[model samples]
Target: SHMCDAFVGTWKLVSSENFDDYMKEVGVGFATRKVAGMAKPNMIISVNGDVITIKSESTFKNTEISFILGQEFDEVTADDRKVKSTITLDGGVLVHVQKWDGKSTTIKRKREDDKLVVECVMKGVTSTRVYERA
Candidate 1:
């Protein structure tokens, strides 16, 4: 079962790019954005049956989500937006989509060369964050 997913492990942030811009589109405050921009978060992914859990750990705060692929759920993001969220697996990539009111965002994660790469997009701006096994 575990062999079916390559994302089951603890991952530490290796680097991030355009995160501030992405957060800006998410409507985070400037001061808060500054704080968040500097904080590196660890990602922990675990799997069971058709359910999966992903956790984000940081010095400032922690956020987590657990769900079955294609099932929609209510979520409060790290920036504190209440949204409808869904996560689906496309091949080895985890594709997360969140919508609030008329605004929405997409986050995708995939493993590359033993590293996990994250892509976050809001509006037309996209951010990239990379992680390594922890």
Candidate 2:
């Protein structure tokens, strides 16, 4: 929806509060937890012609996904679980919903104080990940 101006930038993950809760909720393995706790990951966002691309860069794995707002598509999380994802704009917030295996994951992205704030919820667990412009 022509509402990409605020999210068009590279963001580096600074703090991920309650991310470990997200891990247990997602059934992440033990070995993968350490890298999941890595210092900072990069989330580079860009939009072109009604589609948004988000590149998630980390020490263990790097992945990219592109989707259009309000359209549903197959999305495999970095950990390999598949879901149907749809993103929409809500009051300048990018709200994303991922439905998989009879459950849902919700993600919200917004800019505040020159930083990108991302909130994700899987099941009853939630995590707030803050990132800075890069």
> What are the models' TM-scores?
0.95, 0.93
Q: State residue 40's C-alpha deviation in candidate 1, in Å.
A: 1.2
lDDT of 1 by residue, 35-100 (tens): 899888999998889888999999889999999999999999888889999988788788999999
RMSD of each: 1.2, 1.5
lDDT of each: 0.91, 0.86
Name the regions of candidate 2 deviating beyond 4 angstroms: none
lDDT of 2 by residue, 47-112 (tens): 989889999998878889898889998988877889898999988999999898788889999989
| Model 1: lDDT of residue 58 | 95
Scored by TM-score, the top model is 1
